């Protein structure tokens, strides 16, 4: 039928078959999982190997999560595998850590370090920092006037008009001290503020929309050239984020005692602390690295991230590390480690921790959705598992380097 | 034996390999994880059933206690080197998808892209370490002569059939020297295989300098799943570069801005923003948001996005009436492969499979590596169009 | 001729001869410097290879005065660098003639060229965006969490508040700013920033941190000061924090050069030059991997005046980063529209080389030598918009001479 | 009584008068009538001390302070080598006190460092770090590369072409035509293998030789322009954009300088005995060690630094370099340091230590060594001039002097601030 079934869809869809819809060519069709299905016959015919789509799954995921909200063009799901990771032995509390990776040897490794820092006496980690991110580029018609605007925002007058816009936009929008950088007639204008416990890209979007607006009704010949500059900055390596801080800043430390080191480890305390210098310190000075002064922070970020919903594109600024070992202890042969990460960008609400396979590693975890009676509270103790992991895992890695 | 006993047999036993079966294993793994939760019910909607573990098992994961399912969309046409490609992209943001789409529309319209492999050459960088910075130097200059590298290269050579040592890339920390070691790994992203060969030819390299300590087979040198400036200016994995013209009328209709908008926007966010934020390799709108999405469902290493996201995009003026816009992005980091890994398993098999280059190829090794990053590289300058045009419009 | 040794120990100045003296120090003071000078490079003479080697080293009527026990040790001479002068500089209405030591050929003659394109442009624009030394210790506490109690502490108002007052106890020009820390496990890197009037203030900020920390250990007894310098400053190397923070003078300068300009003077199209400036000091800095290097070189002319002005040349390394941006401007968009910004301007116009005379002519050309008693730091940010201003300059000639070919 | 400028011309005209019989206000009054240009002042008057002293008689009635120029000096000095070579628009020189600090123990030689600064401390401390070296055996050095580079920026119509100019520069056939165009422009240009990067349309080529005992800057862009000469003769559609495109990269931080070397890579190193540390330096090997970590590395890494690990290593590069005639706007590149501080000996308590500075710019020859205050210092070093039995050996000697008394310098800052 070619006539009929365009007054068949009038009426509805559960009528017409798969050839007819296709003989046409997401509200129109009825149950989620058949658009899908006819998406991918549509996708298949244009594929040289039609075949290709046969072992991408699709059937019997809950799709009403995903559809205008985390994907479009939807053909199905990947599947990662999850291993988990522990007990982590963090702040007085057992974490077991679930790691969606295709990595072999890293669920395994970043066990043994967490049994090197569980029979050490546990880790403990702090929450430094906490706001999330957005830096615009505006431009003036001269230097001088965007000079002039820099200053205007410097004072505690100009900074409480744009603070009151950025605030009304949401609960937890809450503008803190503005970093602004001048490039002649431009200025970038990092605005931070925290976002309870979403990452808060949205949030801080929004409040930025709001202050730059306002700030336009005080310098109306002042242009708005994006509302990202990388000034932010999101998802690009960058200097600002290491030194400023974007997310959460985060700390954690453990003592691995001596016999530790040499059972579950199967290395010295003298050897990882060489290896950690002659690797993590200078090795990365010698590469030009600003942040990487570790080991595979990026492999634990990662793997974490993309089991409980987060945006793994935002590895590339989390991952940013610097892991630090010293002797210590009575005789000086028991290993002192840190880990320093200033810019983990995490959430537990929104995006992809709207998804209940990602909000089973949450759950696993204690920290699923927001926290009620402390916002923040779920988002920076995951920060503060993430941490902690990276440390398990940099123990591990750095072991396996230092015995060869 | 334990074929015969019950889930909970095991479990008050103990209150790997003995299961036999897959499913089974990673049912009472959950089981047993369950009991030192606070929450043992959190696992309920952490599915585990029915998924092909075979392929993991021993090579992908460990302590496998389900599957996490990313959902997957399609942007494309992708027209590029006179090719068609509908792109897999595994995520969790919305609109990111339909956005890297209307991209690919601006580029389809346009004529198309036209892209480039630069250079490839997976890496490691191992710190070894002499009794003296006399001694460091003295190894430096006899890997630099022709008799000392070919002997090096012998030895890297010979732990496989794709390994082809290339010039080796030397630097001194006073007793410490720094080798990046560099060689073509197939289609393979080459890791293992790279990391094989380093350890025979520091092996070899111990023979001549036997007092050299191999301090670790990876110094941060690599520089691997950290940003290194090495990475940037020499490459590591794929060099890629890619490019179109968008005609006036595209940029006006699909992309809701003008060519003079996107130009301007390019240079003070990518360009001087990124300069003002301390960058190096991160002069674009979001390389790493295709990158990640793209990996995902080509069961590449995630983590390394870190480096593989490295890109430059550019733009200017084109055409007779100097109202076309050109762009290009410049990818000197694409680590990525085609064969071992994540790429042994079915359903990421499936995404490769759509794009053509699923496998090792028989006929011209590293094509289908080298045609992935191909895509990768073009599938971002998608992405980069229409987010800037987003930020344009404003 | 020659005395004893006993002979001479007796009457041991102006008696005694130069050979004399030099017998005393070979066996294991001086009326005036410059006899003193004598005598140190007659004992260096004999221990070179080539005995007549400070032969063209002069010493002479030099006024050693205020360079010993100040400026420098062991002093065997002088080094004359040659000071050339490019201007008028037609800056913030005003005009400078700026000195410019310096043995590089072409650099004084092409900077002239450059305030020749700005003097018939109607002159440059400049503005300080901020003026701050900073000190950046290292401090170390027994865990990650102790170091992150100090960081805590510091950052409530009344934690501040207490170092603030110590810091600026030490001094009457010390005005403490925010901290910025940055915890590295159990270290803890406190990067100290205050004004400084018209000095540099490396020495004023350091005595102010020095005081600022024995405060802070009064609260944290278990804190140990590993180094008042951690390299969190940044001093003399370069540093990424000195690029988004500041040290010292944050400053932008600014002019519009007309097309007749650009052609005539310049020799090249204001089309030519922003293809090479966003080719070159843009996407060629980013190639090679540059933090704060995106200017053709600004090096050349901030090293040629600190030299002549007595500036600390050292600084150069820092003092250098600079961001020069090119556009088209105008009702014809034929004119061209640059800016040169320079976060990192470590100046001063009191203290250290700036104390000799030689180099205080060539202050007192521009009128910043000395400090401002009236408005303290204006000399001192003044010459901070000289450099900016004489760099945009250097930036107009050299990539003119690029884009020419 | 002056006279009126129609007559002056014609005096100065006269083959058998010239400037001497005219009075200085008399030539203020030519130059002032656009008659005499100011920066020749140097050819047209019968000395060059003179056409200096009107210049700034001149710049003297420009100035608010007319009595601006009293104390800086411009009388004796040697003009001549200056003029045309070196400075333009003199009005005198800049006297910088030059200090002594050594011997410094270096390479089974000793070596009497002249520095040029008017930091207080400076001479003294770096002294203190060479006894310290001296009492312990002495240093080691050695030149790892030698080098120095231009960076241009060529485009080319699209990318794929560009892509197509980078595979042919890659190729040996390619690459021999390139090297011999580069090679001859001078007897020592010996190009090395070419350092390439895309950037859509453009290409960036990094073009590295030696240069004898010359800095090379003149040298090597001279050779870079015939070259690219070359390569437009295959490439016609080939723009070039600049013969610097910033990839040299020169007098500007870049991590491409730290990574790849420019100039002179250099090494040195030196082990400090436990009593020796204690008694000259103040402080303990322990001590010396916690700080060197903490500062120099993990410090230069929390502030972001490329190519900054170590103390004061700009201090000595500037210092010898404002003393030797070398170019001290290229400190920015060639204070590029990396300082190492381990435990060391029998019972652990020596003190090893090495600097490795991989982007020392330097020369013996050219430029303001070309000057013989310049080469007085270069003479107490024994490496003025060009080596003619072999060339470079006088510029790689200074550049391992430099290296050498940059880890004297390190050894005792460290020290004071170890012991604060
Ligand atoms: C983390 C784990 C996946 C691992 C380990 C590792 O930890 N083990 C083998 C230990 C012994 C272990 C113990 C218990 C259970 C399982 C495995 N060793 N390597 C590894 C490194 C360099 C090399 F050349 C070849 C392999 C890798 C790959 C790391 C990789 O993803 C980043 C690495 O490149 C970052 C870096 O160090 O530069
Ligand atoms: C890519 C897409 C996910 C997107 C778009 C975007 O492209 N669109 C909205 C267009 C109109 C579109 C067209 C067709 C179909 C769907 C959507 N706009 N933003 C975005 C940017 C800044 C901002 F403040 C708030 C939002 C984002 C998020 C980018 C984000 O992941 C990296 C970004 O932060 C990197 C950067 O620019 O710094
Ligand atoms: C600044 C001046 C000293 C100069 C000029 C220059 O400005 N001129 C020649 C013009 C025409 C001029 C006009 C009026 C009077 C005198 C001279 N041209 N070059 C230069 C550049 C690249 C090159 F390959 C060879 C030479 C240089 C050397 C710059 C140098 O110190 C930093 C440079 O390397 C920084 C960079 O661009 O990378
Ligand atoms: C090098 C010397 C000039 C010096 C010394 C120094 O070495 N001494 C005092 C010792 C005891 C000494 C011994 C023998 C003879 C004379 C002097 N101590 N400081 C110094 C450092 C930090 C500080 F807060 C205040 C002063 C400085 C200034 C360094 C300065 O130019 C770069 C420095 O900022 C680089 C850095 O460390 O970040």
């Known amino acids: 039928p070619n006539e009929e079934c365009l007054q068949i869809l009038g009426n509805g869809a559960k009528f017409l078959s798969d050839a007819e819809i296709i003989q046409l060519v997401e509200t129109l069709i009825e149950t989620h999982e058949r658009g899908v299905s006819i998406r991918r016959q549509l996708l298949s015919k ?91 580029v505006v431009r003036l018609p001269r230097a001088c006037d965007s000079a002039e605007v820099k200053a205007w925002l410097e004072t505690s007058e100009g900074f409480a008009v744009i603070k009151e816009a950025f605030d009304s936009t949401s609960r937890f929008a809450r503008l803190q001290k503005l970093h602004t950088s001048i490039a002649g007639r431009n200025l970038y204008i990092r605005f931070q503020s925290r976002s309870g416990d979403a990452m808060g890209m949205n949030m801080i979007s929004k409040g930025t929309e709001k202050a730059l607006s306002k700030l336009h009704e005080y310098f109306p010949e002042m242009q708005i050239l994006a509302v990202s500059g990388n000034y932010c900055t999101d998802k690009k390596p960058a200097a600002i984020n290491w030194i400023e801080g974007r997310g959460k800043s985060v700390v954690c430390e453990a003592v691995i005692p001596a016999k530790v080191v040499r059972e579950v480890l199967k290395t010295t305390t003298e050897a990882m602390i060489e290896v950690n210098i002659n690797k993590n310190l200078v090795g990365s000075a010698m590469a030009g690295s600003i942040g990487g002064y570790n080991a595979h922070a990026a492999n634990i970020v990662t793997a974490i991230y993309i089991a409980c919903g987060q945006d793994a ?23 002192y480690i840190s880990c320093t990460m200033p810019s983990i960008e995490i959430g537990t609400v929104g995006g992809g921790t709207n998804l209940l396979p990602q909000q089973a590693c949450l759950q696993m975890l204690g920290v699923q959705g927001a926290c009620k009676d ?24 750095m072991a396996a380097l230092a015995a060869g």
């Open 46 to 136: 244009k594929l040289s190997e039609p075949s290709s789509l046969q072992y991408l799954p699709y059937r019997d995921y809950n799709y009403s999560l995903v559809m205008g909200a985390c994907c479009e063009n939807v053909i199905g799901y990947m599947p990662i595998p999850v291993g988990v990771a522990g007990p982590l032995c963090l702040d007085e509390k057992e974490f077991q850590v679930p790691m969606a990776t295709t990595e072999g040897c890293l669920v395994a490794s970043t066990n043994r370090g967490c049994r090197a820092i569980g029979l050490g006496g546990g880790a403990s980690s702090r929450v430094l920092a906490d706001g999330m991110t957005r830096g615009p």
């Open 374 to 397: 402390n916002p923040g509270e779920n988002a920076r103790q995951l920060a503060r598992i993430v941490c902690g992991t990276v440390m398990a895992g940099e123990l591990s890695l």
């Open 313 to 335: 594109a935002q590895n590339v600024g989390s991952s940013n590390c610097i892991t630090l070992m010293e002797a210590s202890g009575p005789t000086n042969e028991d290993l």
